[PDB]
Ligand binder design. Structure first.
Ligand SMILES: Nc1nc2ncc([C@@H](O)[C@H](O)CO)nc2c(=O)[nH]1
Length: 267
């Protein structure tokens, strides 16, 4: 066996409902947050510094309607999708630094074929590759059915990288963004409830883009007040400003670690 098999959380597109999608996202969230380190009620993701590699990754087994499966690697410290495995191959985005390049070797070690892409996995590289921006890519259970198939066929040549980058973007939103924001799990539940496939709107896209910033402002907010107004976007593109963490408590599910557990405050 490898020294600690990282936790795997399974999900299927096969008979999905709002109940099985909520379950899956609760589980994933419950795998990521320390439990403790609750800043003004939001759980903070564990600091990358004193984190042992045998605690670094969560694996998500994405099954499918035609019994094809993909296993994604999730980085606990930010819920980032760092790479994936399909059949006997494993592919990882290009790491952003040496430390990450190092850690990534402890992932799917039993695969025969490992590949590290030339490009990184952030939305900008991926939108350019997909040749289609996030607001023009559809989300919902049918798009996720299509994504898992694409990732699995990349191994046996039904590649086409535009389609593969598009499939990663779809998968990053319905899994890591849904976990980061209670708001975005809500958009996906509606698409699954009505069996809709719709692109994300401005309120959804700006939350994705502002998560780091939100984590820093909530962690350095004085008492509950943001030391300067953060503007978000409405679903119609109107900007508005949030000045206080309470507005965001039903919105953001977890935060990336930025500052010191306060002094304590948990008990
Ligand atoms: N591979 C992969 N790529 C990503 N790119 C951007 C973001 C965003 O959530 C950033 O926080 C801001 O755009 N998340 C991810 C992600 O989890 N996985």
């Amino acid at each position: 066996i490898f020294p600690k098999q990282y936790p795997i959380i399974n999900f299927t597109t096969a008979g999905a409902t709002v109940q099985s999608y909520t379950n899956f996202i609760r589980a994933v969230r419950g795998r990521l947050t320390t439990g403790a380190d609750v800043r003004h009620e939001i759980p903070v993701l564990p600091n990358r510094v004193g984190l042992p590699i045998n605690q670094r990754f969560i694996l998500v087994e994405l099954s499918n309607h035609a019994e094809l499966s993909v296993t994604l690697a999730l980085d606990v410290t930010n819920a980032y999708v760092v790479g994936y495995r399909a059949g006997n191959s494993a592919y990882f985005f290009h790491p952003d630094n040496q430390e990450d390049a190092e850690a990534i070797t402890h992932l799917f070690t039993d695969v025969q074929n490992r590949y590290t892409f030339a490009f990184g996995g952030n939305y900008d590289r991926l939108e350019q590759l997909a040749g289609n921006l996030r607001e023009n890519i559809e989300l919902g259970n049918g798009p996720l059915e299509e994504a898992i198939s694409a990732l699995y066929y990349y191994s046996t040549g039904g590649t086409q990288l535009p389609t593969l980058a598009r499939s990663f973007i779809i998968c990053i939103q319905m899994i890591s963004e849904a976990a980061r924001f209670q708001y975005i799990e809500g958009e996906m539940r509606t698409r699954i409830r009505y069996n809709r496939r719709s692109a994300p709107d401005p309120s959804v896209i700006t939350l994705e883009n502002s998560w780091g910033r939100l984590s820093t402002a909530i962690q350095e907010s004085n008492q509950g007040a943001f030391a300067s107004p953060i503007q978000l976007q409405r679903r119609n593109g109107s900007k508005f400003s949030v000045y206080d963490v309470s507005i965001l408590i039903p919105i953001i599910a977890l935060m990336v670690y930025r500052c010191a557990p306060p002094p304590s405050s948990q008990f």
